[PDB]
Amino acid sequence: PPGTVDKKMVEKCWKLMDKVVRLCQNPKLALKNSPPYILDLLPDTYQHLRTILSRYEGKMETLGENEYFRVFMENLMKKTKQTISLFKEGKERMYEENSQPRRNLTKLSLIFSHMLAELKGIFPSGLFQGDTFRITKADAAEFWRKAFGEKTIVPWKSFRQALHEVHPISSGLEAMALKSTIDLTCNDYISVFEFDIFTRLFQPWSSLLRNWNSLAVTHPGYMAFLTYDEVKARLQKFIHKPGSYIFRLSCTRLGQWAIGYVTADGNILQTIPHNKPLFQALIDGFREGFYLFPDGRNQNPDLTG
Amino acid sequence: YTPEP
């Protein structure tokens, strides 16, 4: 594990978020004001940590001893530092849309949003609930508790091994694929929260990895760490090709899918499917004319089986 | 987000 968190540890990141914020208030950035919005996420995080801190009144060093939280505070300083190092080591090219240091900022924005979700799900009301966490899918629940008990968080390697025993992982490159599908906070730890989001998105547990294989590894329409505005912008190029669609993880309704597609009246709509697995949304969308050409490609995966 | 097609 990583070091003790004291009160002086937290003043550190508060100062670092401050520097991130002021850096993000640059007119030149022309920072769209929509989820994930770094300029809210950061204040909200601090806000939530005040909450956690104000509740660990006095016993402020039972908290200092929390593993998950010690990992979190670490990652947090880490991520905020990276971010600061982009504005430095990337100088001017922050400012062209579709440039490295600017997509990386979106990625970072994204991770930041995953962090706050993870935290809030582990500390609802600001008071630790990691080990009493309800996992959503019956069968995923079974696996986790029967492999990690009431642990909130494991290291990646640990998780990989455990998973492999039940759902073998074809290869090292695949493992690596999986690792960045599931490590939403990019911390080389898998948390119970992280695990639930993956297991919801890729049900039934029974065929978990086969599912993930068909919907993400081998699927032209899957998009990785992509935001809503990014989906609108990407599908611009197919505006004259209705049926063109992509899809991704919803950022605000974490654990759910967000399909984006071009209509015959020529707008670009986005839905969160409900009460169907993703498989069937996509099959029906094909069958019904709405989801025909993934990311523009004429060729569309057969999933009926 | 908007209703499924």
UniProtKB/Swiss-Prot annotation, chain A:
Q: Where is this region: SH2-like?
A: 203-305
PTM comment: the record says:
Phosphorylated on tyrosine residues by ALK, EGFR, SYK, FYN and ZAP70. Phosphorylated on tyrosine residues in response to FLT1 and KIT signaling. Phosphorylated on tyrosine residues by INSR and FGR. Phosphorylated on several tyrosine residues by constitutively activated FGFR3. Phosphorylated on tyrosine residues by activated CSF1R, PDGFRA and PDGFRB. Phosphorylated on tyrosine residues by HCK.
Which residues are noted in the entry as Ca(2+)-binding?
A: D183, T185, N187, Y189, E194
In residue numbers, the region (EF-hand-like) covers: 130-202
Q: Where in the cell is it found?
A: Cytoplasm; Cell membrane; Cell projection, Cilium; Golgi apparatus
* Region annotation 4H: where it falls in the sequence: 1-129
Effect seen on changing K241R: Found in patients with acute myeloid leukemia; uncertain significance
Q: Which residues form the Cbl-PTB domain?
A: 1-305
Q: What does UniProt give as the signal peptide span?
A: none
Enumerate the residues binding 4-O-phospho-L-tyrosine: R248
Q: Where does the record place the region Sufficient for interaction with EPHB1? A: 1-305
Its UniProt miscellaneous note says:
This protein has one functional calcium-binding site.
Described function: E3 ubiquitin-protein ligase that acts as a negative regulator of many signaling pathways by mediating ubiquitination of cell surface receptors. Accepts ubiquitin from specific E2 ubiquitin-conjugating enzymes, and then transfers it to substrates promoting their degradation by the proteasome. Recognizes activated receptor tyrosine kinases, including KIT, FLT1, FGFR1, FGFR2, PDGFRA, PDGFRB, CSF1R, EPHA8 and KDR and mediates their ubiquitination to terminate signaling. Recognizes membrane-bound HCK, SRC and other kinases of the SRC family and mediates their ubiquitination and degradation.
User: Which disease is reported for it?
Assistant: Noonan syndrome-like disorder with or without juvenile myelomonocytic leukemia: A syndrome characterized by a phenotype reminiscent of Noonan syndrome. Clinical features are highly variable, including facial dysmorphism, short neck, developmental delay, hyperextensible joints and thorax abnormalities with widely spaced nipples. The facial features consist of triangular face with hypertelorism, large low-set ears, ptosis, and flat nasal bridge. Some patients manifest cardiac defects. Some have an increased risk for certain malignancies, particularly juvenile myelomonocytic leukemia.
The record comments on the domains as follows:
The RING-type zinc finger domain mediates binding to an E2 ubiquitin-conjugating enzyme.
How this chain assembles, per its entry, is:
Forms homodimers; IFT20 promotes the formation of stable homodimers. Associates with NCK via its SH3 domain. The phosphorylated C-terminus interacts with CD2AP via its second SH3 domain. Binds to UBE2L3. Interacts with adapters SLA, SLA2 and with the phosphorylated C-terminus of SH2B2. Interacts with EGFR, SYK and ZAP70 via the highly conserved Cbl-N region. Also interacts with SORBS1 and INPPL1/SHIP2. Interacts with phosphorylated LAT2. Interacts with CBLB. Interacts with ALK, AXL, BLK, FGR and FGFR2. (Microbial infection) Interacts with M.tuberculosis LpqN, which influences the balance between intrinsic antibacterial and antiviral defense.
According to UniProt, the name of this protein is: E3 ubiquitin-protein ligase CBL
Organism (species): Homo sapiens (Human)
Residues represented out of the complete protein: 47 to 351 of 906
